[PDB]
Design an enzyme around this catalytic site. Structure first.
Site, PDB file in Angstrom:
ATOM      1  N   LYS A   1      72.244  75.166  -7.386  1.00  0.00           N
ATOM      2  CA  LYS A   1      71.618  76.404  -6.359  1.00  0.00           C
ATOM      3  C   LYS A   1      70.176  76.145  -6.243  1.00  0.00           C
ATOM      4  CE  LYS A   1      74.289  79.570  -9.349  1.00  0.00           C
ATOM      5  NZ  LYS A   1      74.112  79.054 -10.690  1.00  0.00           N
TER       6      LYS A   1
ATOM      7  N   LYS B   1      80.153  82.040 -19.586  1.00  0.00           N
ATOM      8  CA  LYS B   1      79.127  81.106 -20.580  1.00  0.00           C
ATOM      9  C   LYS B   1      79.557  81.336 -22.075  1.00  0.00           C
ATOM     10  CE  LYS B   1      75.163  80.448 -23.341  1.00  0.00           C
ATOM     11  NZ  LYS B   1      75.183  81.178 -24.481  1.00  0.00           N
TER      12      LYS B   1
ATOM     13  N   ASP C   1      78.944  75.598 -13.658  1.00  0.00           N
ATOM     14  CA  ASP C   1      77.964  76.223 -12.738  1.00  0.00           C
ATOM     15  C   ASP C   1      76.568  76.084 -13.325  1.00  0.00           C
ATOM     16  OD1 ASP C   1      77.584  78.363 -10.504  1.00  0.00           O
ATOM     17  OD2 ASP C   1      76.504  79.211 -12.352  1.00  0.00           O
TER      18      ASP C   1
ATOM     19  N   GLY D   1      85.140  79.131 -14.294  1.00  0.00           N
ATOM     20  CA  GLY D   1      83.939  78.236 -14.197  1.00  0.00           C
ATOM     21  C   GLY D   1      83.258  78.418 -15.507  1.00  0.00           C
TER      22      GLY D   1
ATOM     23  N   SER E   1      76.990  89.843 -19.312  1.00  0.00           N
ATOM     24  CA  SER E   1      75.446  89.140 -19.419  1.00  0.00           C
ATOM     25  C   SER E   1      75.046  88.410 -20.676  1.00  0.00           C
ATOM     26  CB  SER E   1      74.332  89.655 -18.907  1.00  0.00           C
ATOM     27  OG  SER E   1      73.613  90.450 -19.527  1.00  0.00           O
ATOM     28  N   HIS E   2      74.207  87.614 -20.626  1.00  0.00           N
ATOM     29  CA  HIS E   2      73.331  86.918 -21.765  1.00  0.00           C
ATOM     30  C   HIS E   2      72.528  88.059 -22.593  1.00  0.00           C
ATOM     31  CE1 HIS E   2      70.171  87.112 -18.593  1.00  0.00           C
ATOM     32  NE2 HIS E   2      70.905  86.172 -17.857  1.00  0.00           N
TER      33      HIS E   2
HETATM   34  N1  LIG Z   1      73.855  83.455  -9.542  1.00  0.00           N
HETATM   35  C1  LIG Z   1      73.082  84.234 -10.484  1.00  0.00           C
HETATM   36  O1  LIG Z   1      72.026  84.922 -10.089  1.00  0.00           O
HETATM   37  C2  LIG Z   1      73.580  84.088 -11.770  1.00  0.00           C
HETATM   38  C3  LIG Z   1      73.172  85.209 -12.600  1.00  0.00           C
HETATM   39  C4  LIG Z   1      73.459  85.209 -14.036  1.00  0.00           C
HETATM   40  C5  LIG Z   1      74.605  84.351 -14.488  1.00  0.00           C
HETATM   41  N2  LIG Z   1      74.948  83.214 -13.426  1.00  0.00           N
HETATM   42  C6  LIG Z   1      75.902  82.340 -13.879  1.00  0.00           C
HETATM   43  O2  LIG Z   1      77.017  82.816 -14.626  1.00  0.00           O
HETATM   44  C7  LIG Z   1      76.998  82.563 -16.155  1.00  0.00           C
HETATM   45  C8  LIG Z   1      77.587  83.360 -16.972  1.00  0.00           C
HETATM   46  O3  LIG Z   1      76.805  84.545 -16.862  1.00  0.00           O
HETATM   47  P1  LIG Z   1      75.922  85.017 -18.130  1.00  0.00           P
HETATM   48  O4  LIG Z   1      75.312  83.721 -18.641  1.00  0.00           O
HETATM   49  O5  LIG Z   1      75.192  86.244 -17.915  1.00  0.00           O
HETATM   50  O6  LIG Z   1      76.923  85.227 -19.467  1.00  0.00           O
HETATM   51  P2  LIG Z   1      78.526  85.700 -19.699  1.00  0.00           P
HETATM   52  O7  LIG Z   1      79.339  84.921 -19.391  1.00  0.00           O
HETATM   53  O8  LIG Z   1      78.671  87.176 -19.109  1.00  0.00           O
HETATM   54  O9  LIG Z   1      78.304  85.976 -21.295  1.00  0.00           O
HETATM   55  C9  LIG Z   1      77.720  85.157 -22.075  1.00  0.00           C
HETATM   56  C10 LIG Z   1      77.829  85.684 -23.213  1.00  0.00           C
HETATM   57  O10 LIG Z   1      79.206  86.205 -23.609  1.00  0.00           O
HETATM   58  C11 LIG Z   1      79.300  85.369 -24.938  1.00  0.00           C
HETATM   59  N3  LIG Z   1      80.903  85.241 -24.958  1.00  0.00           N
HETATM   60  C12 LIG Z   1      81.132  84.123 -24.284  1.00  0.00           C
HETATM   61  N4  LIG Z   1      82.538  84.157 -24.498  1.00  0.00           N
HETATM   62  C13 LIG Z   1      82.823  85.041 -25.377  1.00  0.00           C
HETATM   63  C14 LIG Z   1      84.088  85.443 -26.027  1.00  0.00           C
HETATM   64  N5  LIG Z   1      85.357  84.766 -25.948  1.00  0.00           N
HETATM   65  N6  LIG Z   1      83.939  86.546 -26.875  1.00  0.00           N
HETATM   66  C15 LIG Z   1      82.780  87.080 -27.064  1.00  0.00           C
HETATM   67  N7  LIG Z   1      81.478  86.821 -26.418  1.00  0.00           N
HETATM   68  C16 LIG Z   1      81.667  85.685 -25.670  1.00  0.00           C
HETATM   69  C17 LIG Z   1      78.121  84.355 -25.101  1.00  0.00           C
HETATM   70  O11 LIG Z   1      77.920  84.047 -26.342  1.00  0.00           O
HETATM   71  P3  LIG Z   1      78.116  82.489 -26.969  1.00  0.00           P
HETATM   72  O12 LIG Z   1      77.283  81.442 -26.012  1.00  0.00           O
HETATM   73  O13 LIG Z   1      77.334  82.736 -28.225  1.00  0.00           O
HETATM   74  O14 LIG Z   1      79.530  82.293 -26.887  1.00  0.00           O
HETATM   75  C18 LIG Z   1      77.062  84.767 -24.020  1.00  0.00           C
HETATM   76  O15 LIG Z   1      76.170  85.364 -25.183  1.00  0.00           O
HETATM   77  C19 LIG Z   1      75.555  81.953 -16.167  1.00  0.00           C
HETATM   78  O16 LIG Z   1      75.689  81.136 -17.456  1.00  0.00           O
HETATM   79  C20 LIG Z   1      75.275  81.225 -14.917  1.00  0.00           C
HETATM   80  O17 LIG Z   1      75.768  80.002 -14.956  1.00  0.00           O
HETATM   81  C21 LIG Z   1      74.356  83.291 -12.188  1.00  0.00           C
HETATM   82  C1  LIG Z   2      64.519  83.041 -16.194  1.00  0.00           C
HETATM   83  C2  LIG Z   2      63.435  82.483 -14.997  1.00  0.00           C
HETATM   84  C3  LIG Z   2      62.151  81.817 -15.236  1.00  0.00           C
HETATM   85  C4  LIG Z   2      64.348  81.305 -14.170  1.00  0.00           C
HETATM   86  C5  LIG Z   2      65.613  82.245 -13.892  1.00  0.00           C
HETATM   87  C6  LIG Z   2      65.580  82.762 -12.578  1.00  0.00           C
HETATM   88  C7  LIG Z   2      66.675  83.499 -11.914  1.00  0.00           C
HETATM   89  C8  LIG Z   2      67.785  83.297 -12.686  1.00  0.00           C
HETATM   90  C9  LIG Z   2      68.869  84.085 -12.346  1.00  0.00           C
HETATM   91  C10 LIG Z   2      68.831  85.596 -12.461  1.00  0.00           C
HETATM   92  C11 LIG Z   2      70.210  83.630 -12.751  1.00  0.00           C
HETATM   93  O1  LIG Z   2      70.312  83.878 -13.816  1.00  0.00           O
HETATM   94  O2  LIG Z   2      71.155  82.587 -12.313  1.00  0.00           O
HETATM   95  C12 LIG Z   2      67.842  82.827 -14.101  1.00  0.00           C
HETATM   96  C13 LIG Z   2      66.868  82.074 -14.553  1.00  0.00           C
END
Ligand SMILES: NC(=O)c1ccc[n+]([C@@H]2O[C@H](COP(=O)([O-])OP(=O)(O)OC[C@H]3O[C@@H](n4cnc5c(N)ncnc54)[C@H](OP(=O)(O)O)[C@@H]3O)[C@@H](O)[C@H]2O)c1
Ligand SMILES: CC(C)Cc1ccc([C@H](C)C(=O)O)cc1
Length: 316
Positions: free
Chosen positions: A81, A267, A47, A17, A218-219
């Protein structure tokens, strides 16, 4: 064709995803471009969430790729969500319908309870009193879940699930009298520094899919993530596996999840990295490689959301 897993409701989820959250210093424009590029690259699962404040842009990306003939709607798996200001049961359907209006889509493939701690209703996603205190709300999540079921029966969400639920909270849903639909998934943080073996096995035992976020460490956005946390992708084992396979540490981390039966999010807003990440389907890890990665586990949770700590339903 593309790799999917069968959910406990009979629907299918693509196993890789595309994550859409970016920190607020990143313009929303970037979401539109990045989702288009992800679809072009071969992502079929996208997502998002109401709280990401990007559904207008993500939806336009999807609509665009449908309208220009690139992909059919049935070949996109879109997740939204339910944010915590809409836990009250009567507010669930309106929140879904608001997301759908923003997206200009007719249904989501998956609707999750985003986070188990409730906050007061209203437009504000983190409502605070005059003194900066979060305005927490008391809501029976079983009632929230019955409202989610109704959304499924309405055809507004093809599947329903949860996010950030622990064992106790999952059990509360699973043991609910009159349960109609189990959650299809529990979307939680999962990566080689926090591999979630216990919770993964639990979820497997109930045919609930674990969907990994922050799978690439993570971000790292402040204040949400402690800057002093270790950087996952600098790990020396991941880097040596990457070198060995002529891949990258990100791809190793992604592939680890797929082989252990986890659906993995990734992401990126960078064109090259978006294209890279789909190469997860191009190679495989041996049993000794998988055990080396298992060995990395170190109980590092990047995402605590500890502003919502205090109420009983805080999951960590
Ligand atoms: N349900 C929740 O509470 C929740 C919480 C956190 C996250 N999420 C979901 O999960 C997604 C992913 O988690 P996340 O945003 O924390 O990030 P992640 O997927 O762990 O990582 C994103 C980081 O890794 C970098 N990256 C991506 N591909 C790469 C690669 N091939 N080589 C090196 N660096 C790479 C990206 O930078 P660049 O963009 O510069 O490539 C970004 O800074 C979110 O976007 C959201 O959709 C959900
Ligand atoms: C940044 C805040 C204002 C909104 C917010 C709240 C929860 C999440 C969770 C942890 C997720 O990353 O999916 C993201 C963004």
């Amino acid at each position: 064709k593309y790799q999917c897993v069968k959910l406990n409701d009979g629907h299918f989820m693509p196993v890789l995803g595309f994550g859409t959250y970016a920190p607020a210093e990143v313009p929303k424009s970037k979401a539109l471009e990045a989702v288009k590029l992800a679809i072009e690259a071969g992502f079929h699962h996208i997502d998002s969430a109401h709280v990401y404040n990007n559904e207008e842009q993500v939806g336009l990306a999807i609509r665009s790729k449908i309208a220009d003939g690139s992909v059919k709607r049935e070949d996109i798996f879109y997740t939204s969500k339910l944010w915590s200001n809409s836990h009250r049961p009567e507010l669930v359907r309106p929140a879904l319908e608001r997301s759908l209006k923003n997206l200009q889509l007719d249904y989501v493939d998956l609707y999750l309870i985003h986070f188990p701690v409730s906050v007061k209703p209203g437009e504000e996603v983190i409502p605070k009193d005059e003194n900066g205190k979060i305005l927490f709300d008391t809501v029976d999540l079983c009632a929230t879940w019955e409202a989610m079921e109704k959304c499924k029966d309405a055809g507004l969400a093809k599947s329903i699930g949860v996010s950030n639920f622990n064992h106790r909270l999952l059990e509360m849903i699973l043991n609910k009298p009159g349960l109609k639909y189990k959650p299809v998934c529990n979307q939680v943080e999962c990566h080689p520094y926090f591999n979630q073996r216990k919770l993964l096995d639990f979820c497997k035992s109930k045919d609930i899919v674990l969907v990994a976020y922050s799978a690439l460490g993570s971000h790292r956005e402040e204040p949400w993530v402690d800057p002093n946390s270790p950087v996952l992708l600098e790990d020396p084992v991941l880097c040596a596996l990457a070198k060995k396979h002529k891949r990258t540490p990100a791809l190793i981390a992604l592939r680890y999840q797929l082989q252990r039966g986890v659906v993995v999010l990734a992401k990126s807003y960078n064109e090259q990295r978006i294209r890279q990440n789909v190469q997860v389907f191009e190679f495989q890890l041996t049993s000794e490689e998988m055990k080396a990665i298992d060995g990395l586990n170190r109980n590092v949770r990047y995402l605590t959301l500890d502003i919502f700590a205090g109420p009983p339903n805080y999951p960590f």
